[PDB]
Amino acid sequence: GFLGIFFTGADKNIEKATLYKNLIAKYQNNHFISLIILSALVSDSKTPLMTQYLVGYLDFPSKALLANKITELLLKELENPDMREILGSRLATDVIEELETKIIRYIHNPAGSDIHSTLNLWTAD
Amino acid sequence: KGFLGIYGFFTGADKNIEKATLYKNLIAKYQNNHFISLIILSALVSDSKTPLMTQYLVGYLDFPSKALLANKITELLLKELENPDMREILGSRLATDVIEELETKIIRYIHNPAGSDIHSTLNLWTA
Amino acid sequence: GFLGIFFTGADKNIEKATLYKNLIAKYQNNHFISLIILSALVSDSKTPLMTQYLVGYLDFPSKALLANKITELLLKELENPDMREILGSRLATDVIEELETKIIRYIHNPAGSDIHSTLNLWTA
Amino acid sequence: KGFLGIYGFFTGADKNIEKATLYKNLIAKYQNNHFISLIILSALVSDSKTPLMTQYLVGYLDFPSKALLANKITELLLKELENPDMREILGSRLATDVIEELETKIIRYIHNPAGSDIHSTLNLWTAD
Ligand SMILES: [Mg+2]
Ligand SMILES: [Mg+2]
Ligand SMILES: [Mg+2]
Ligand SMILES: [Mg+2]
Ligand code: NA
Ligand code: NA
Ligand code: NA
Ligand SMILES: [Zn+2]
Ligand SMILES: [Zn+2]
Ligand SMILES: [Zn+2]
Ligand SMILES: [Zn+2]
């Protein structure tokens, strides 16, 4: 299991590493939001060393193969255990890309987004 | 429970046959190559002009949705591309951009086959 | 007449004209990124009215001749010292065709398809 | 440092001798028609199987790259085709699709000369 699910604290970068770490901590027990945050981190162009660490740590040959597996888990999360109720009219591809983009824009511009109001919409408890 | 078979039979039905013709002719043309044939499938799925053919493939390949199917094809493409088989042909570029370029070049070819010669582009990948 | 660097939106109701305009205003400092947005706008088929206005406004006999000039300026901009430093052996024809495709993703679906972080890579 | 002043003296760089022979025979026949001369030059440059002859042409014509050479040929192609003296033979078709089909018809002939009569295709642009 190349994913098999954490904490890096490894030569990390500026504010952005702290903002990501705090987001991961609050939604650590949420598995859909965790992958969404990870996917935004991997897609984040301003986290190259953290991404390369995760690609190596998870035994993946490259970033694109890691990003592909995360998107895959994301779609299988949205395959109606619960959030088909929350999916509704929207397709899973735009919702994923909507959530990831909102996180990256929050990491880049934290003063401009209430990412908690966006993320806890997908909390089941 | 094999989701991706390499030998199979594509549907024969009402698929807006003019563009369905272009796809089937290129798949048959490059059925020799494993990577190139995989690229043609990707362009077909991403193409919004073929909602009948993909939904058949989505159902035929036991995938719950079109997204989960294109994700598997993209995964297989990166494996043959990023992991070295055609990596000697892959140069300074990233395996993502070359696929999204071949996918785009095919879709634009299917949409206007007289404005783009797709054959010589796909011939660039030997074997 | 020939191209050189007055364009205020369009006549009809399309909101995608607004997305193009704000990307243009933000990246006005960079010469290369503006042409990329222009070539992508012209290549965009959801913007036929704005494109036809630019064809006549820049006095070009056709759309193909207009897109041909922008591609020419793009390839030469990538030949300039600073941009050719960002080059890094990547093929000019493809990086332009990729950048074109990727902003049209943000044009059709701005809710996703992170765009600023993408072309912030081409800043300095 | 001029750009695309038509003139002969082309080298036919090195290997791919048969394809170079097919290209020269076409270039030699239609050398008095400017439009077809650039259509053949377009297909030659675009041809993935003439990399040595193209790189010479790029360097010889003092162009920074192959893509910048192909762009200049396309410009003169559309310039000559649409406006001055080919709107007549062009008629109602679109110039871009006409260039690429002629481009593709030449390349398809060069790769397999037995399956195409490129003379009949290219002769529709003589006798203005
Ligand atoms: Mg990243
Ligand atoms: Mg489709
Ligand atoms: Mg347009
Ligand atoms: Mg060539
Ligand atoms: Na924080
Ligand atoms: Na937080
Ligand atoms: Na601030
Ligand atoms: Zn980092
Ligand atoms: Zn269909
Ligand atoms: Zn418009
Ligand atoms: Zn050669």
Residue numbers in the entry:
A (entry chain A): 369 to 373, 376 to 495
B (entry chain B): 368 to 494
C (entry chain C): 369 to 373, 376 to 494
D (entry chain D): 368 to 495
What did the article's authors report about this structure?
While SidM catalyzes the attachment of adenosine monophosphate (AMP) to Rab1, SidD catalyzes AMP removal from Rab1, a process known as deAMPylation. Inactivation and removal of Rab1 is initiated upon translocation of the effector SidD which deAMPylates Rab1, thereby priming it for inactivation by the L. pneumophila GAP LepB and causing its gradual removal from the LCV 4–6 hours after bacterial uptake. SidD is a protein of 507 amino acids with no significant sequence homology to other entries in the database. Taken together, our data revealed that the CTD mediates localization of SidD to membranes using a dual-binding mode that combines a general membrane-binding determinant in form of the loopCTD with a specificity determinant represented by a helix-turn-helix unit at the C-terminus.
